[PDB]
Each structure stands twice: as C-alpha cells, then as structure tokens.
C-alpha cells in the first residue's frame with residue numbers, strides 16, 4: 760500500500776459543490792462516491808444529482824438529514840442515479856422525479872461498515888484505508904467545528920463522546936505531514952471553505968471511533984470495471 764494516496768489527483772473527483780442551507784451532506788457524500796466509483800470503473804467522470812436523492816430516498820429526511828447507505832440502496836433499486844445537469848439542485852425538499860429521468864449512472868452494489876466496541880482502532884484504520892484505496896468512501900461525522908476550519912490538519916477540536924451524526928464527507932485519500940497522518944476529505948461547502956473545499960482529518964489519534972466519530976459508519980458504492 761502507498762504511504763499516501765489521493766483520488767482527487769486521479770481525475771475521478773468532481774469539483775467541490777455547495778449544499779447551501781440544507782442538511783444534505785449525506786446526499787453530496789453519496790453522489791461524490793458514486794461519481795468517483797463510476798469514473799474509476801468506466802473512465803468517464805460526470806457530476807451526479809444530489810436533488811434526486813433528497814426528493815426520492817424516502818428512508819432519509821431530505822434537507823433535515825439523511826444517510827449515505829440509504830442513498831446507495833436507492834440507486835441500486837432504481838437502476839441508477841440522474842446527472843447533476845438533468846436533475847438540478849434546489850437545496851430544498853421536492854417531489855421525486857426519478858421516473859422522468861432517462862440517462863442514469865448505475866452501481867453494482869454497496870458496502871457498509873459500522874464499528875462496534877469489539878473492534879480495535881488498528882483494525883478500523885486498516886479496513887478504512889483498504890476501502891479508500893479501492894474507491895472513495897462516505898463517512899458520517901460530527902461537523903461541529905467545520906465552520907471554524909480554515910486549513911491544516913484537524914485533530915478533533917471540540918468533538919467529544921457522544922459524537923453526533925450531523926454531516927457526511929467523502930474520504931478520497933490519505934497522507935502524512937511531519938509525522939502526523941491524515942485523511943483527505945472532500946466537503947460540500949464550496950471551494951472557498953477549508954483547503955480548496957477539502958479538510959485534512961487526523962487519523963490514528965488513538966480513539967477507535969476516530970476524529971469526531973468518523974470511523975463509525977463508512978459506506979461506499981461498488982462498481983466492477
């Protein structure tokens with residue numbers, strides 16, 4: 760395995776998007792992962808629709824909150840996801856128009872990993888790095904400090920147990936700086952936020968659940984080449 764890896768430099772990651780005043784991080788983390796997995800498997804990178812997920816994933820709650828795995832499940836069940844162009848983002852709840860969509864990007868399946876008190880940090884870090892090398896993954900996280908972030912490696916700051924799940928980000932890679940390891944995470948708050956729209960999250964901090972609970976629930980779309 761590489762000492763560092765960044766899918767955002769491999770031509771499989773779309774530009775950083777802006778979710779606005781809508782708690783749809785779950786949807787952006789999901790489209791971001793599908794966009795990457797699709798590009799990695801087919802060689803074609805195309806921006807996908809967060810709005811379709813917001814309006815159609817009945818198990819989630821649109822702009823209030825939702826889930827990455829429920830989005831992937833919905834995509835498998837409905838033959839694919841619409842493009843950003845064909846199903847524009849409205850930043851608010853809307854009527855599901857999936858039946859009116861012609862072109863769709865499909866996924867073969869999806870994976871999920873929910874940590875239990877039986878796992879160790881080493882195993883958590885190992886499995887996650889393993890998934891990331893195959894394709895970007897979505898993770899739930901407590902983004903309480905995100906509006907304070909401007910750059911550098913975020914170490915968890917004000918996060919503490921219990922970690923709330925109020926946001927999702929896309930882990931596209933990892934690296935290390937001066938002996939400090941970190942994940943490269945794509946956010947959906949515009950390119951002006953953080954490091955060109957991304958945030959470096961410290962890893963191997965010692966807590967099984969990771970920084971702000973990011974190790975807790977990973978989920979990703981699966982697509983064969």
Ligand SMILES: *[C@@H]1O[C@H](CO)[C@@H](O[C@@H]2O[C@H](CO)[C@@H](O)[C@H](O)[C@H]2NC(C)=O)[C@H](O[C@@H]2O[C@@H](C)[C@@H](O)[C@@H](O)[C@@H]2O)[C@H]1NC(C)=O
Pocket residue numbers: 904907908915916917
């Ligand atoms: C943890 O919470 C602290 C209190 O809310 C954060 O500090 C506050 O950050 C604000 C935005 O940067 C700033 O306007 C406040 O003055 C400051 N509060 C105090 C009393 O310092 C803290 O943010 C980090 O630390 C502060 C001091 C600044 O350097 C921020 O830029 C840092 O992000 C939070 N910890 C984090 C976000 O890691």
